[PDB]
Amino acid sequence: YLAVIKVVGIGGGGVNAVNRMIEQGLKGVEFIAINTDAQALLMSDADVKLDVGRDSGADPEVGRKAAEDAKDEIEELLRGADMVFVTAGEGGGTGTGGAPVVASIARKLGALTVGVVTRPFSFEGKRRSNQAENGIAALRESCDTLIVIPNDRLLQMGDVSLMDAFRSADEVLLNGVQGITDLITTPGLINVDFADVKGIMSGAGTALMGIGSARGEGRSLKAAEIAINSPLLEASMEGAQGVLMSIAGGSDLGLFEINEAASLVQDAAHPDANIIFGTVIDDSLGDEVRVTVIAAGF
Amino acid sequence: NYLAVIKVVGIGGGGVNAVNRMIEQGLKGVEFIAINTDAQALLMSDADVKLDVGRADPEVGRKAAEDAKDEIEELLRGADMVFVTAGEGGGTGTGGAPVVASIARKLGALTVGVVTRPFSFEGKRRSNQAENGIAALRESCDTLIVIPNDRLLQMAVSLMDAFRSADEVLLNGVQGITDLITTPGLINVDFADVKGIMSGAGTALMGIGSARGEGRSLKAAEIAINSPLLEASMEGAQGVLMSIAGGSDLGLFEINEAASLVQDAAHPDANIIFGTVIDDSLGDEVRVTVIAAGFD
């Protein structure tokens, strides 16, 4: 089965994240941008662009109505997918209100439905935080798995201006999608295919992600240690009952290194965790390896 | 007009999406027109010509199109052949399609509608609006190619496969014919003979077949003629179009075997248009499309 994967970015933040995914060369997926601004969509490099809410301000009820009014068109665009990602920055109107509609359509159609969203920075204000909380609750009900990335924890990583901060958010949304899709589209020595991913992500519920990267001697152990200690995982890894871990490297990434990383992750996980390890070939990476952990159930 | 001017109009979200699929797959030799009919949403398109007359209901799309009839006419003027489709799903496109078709035909273009019947498992929305859409489009077209998606389940299909299959055959509803006209092969056709079987023909059905290796042309042609999408309309059809696509190496003998088979299968009084299409990207595969129009 050659899986058909679609990645939907909805609202300003989601469409910007999708643009970043395109710029960084994420392959094997169809990119769909949904927003309420036709000029912003003209700039997007997505394969499919839908402008919603045309007759209808950070009001999630407006975003929900705009998506619901477009539900036949969204369903037309998603029909045939085996897997749909719905990506957004939570806390605004279009993404907050519309993402559960998109996800519900994908789930009704039986696609493995993965949400990947951010919680807003605390400095964006209490209304955005409250709106994101409600949007996440709604989205969680419409997704198989919902990966939630707390933007506040990004400020504990990396170097930083406001534009820089939101570029880092774009990048972590990319990392969350690509960490999963590259297992399917560009596997390495340890092949974790669509059926395996569906096995662990179907109905898994809320999830967190951690990412790490390293180079040179001991890179895989270091990358895995960084990933499982990631601030984005909220010190929660030991409580997860389901863990998907992908390690990406060049063609020469060897079984010994892979196994070193897997063993570290096993030792850190809950005694009863179901953990699936997969590898990715990415010949652009040079001497670097990148470990992505998705932790769910919990 | 010794290069037939063919315009392919996608109207509504499903029809625009279908046109976008055709562009992505590199359908050559035709002009693409994307007409958005919804006020509340716009599906963007890479088509050459775009018209947003919206400013989900068949009557809404009909009035949107009627209100823009002068602009649509100017887009279509000069065409020898116009395809019109609302693609998969319903909505406002189902109301707009017969307006565009009526304009094309009043202009003198050979007007070919393409319409899908949804899978039975999709259910049915009220007033028999889908079948009313087919009847309205039929009344406005020279030939209406009807694709019954239910028959795809006879060609073990998964739900995602079923939806992808429907999209692929809709694309073939256009490309099988336009390639025969626009892309050279060993056996080429006169557009006048295409017009001869499709003008005023009414409903048509399509069959598709593919095969590889020895005997591939006969094999693919047998599959196409027996396709469940033709609903055994083949024996009674009074007009038959058949195109064989394959590489430049397709041999005259195997081509002629496939042509002989379709003549044997067709009604004795059928008009039959036959030709081939050189598509060197197919490798050793051949792809046959049969269009059966009219009836006994």
Ligand SMILES: Nc1nc2c(ncn2[C@@H]2O[C@H](COP(=O)(O)OP(=O)(O)O)[C@@H](O)[C@H]2O)c(=O)[nH]1
């Ligand atoms: N990844 C990313 N997130 C953003 C960006 N701009 C804003 N955000 C986040 O996304 C949330 C929603 O804003 P936005 O997507 O513009 O609102 P919407 O268009 O109404 O859904 C904001 O509160 C920010 O946390 C961006 O450029 N990239």
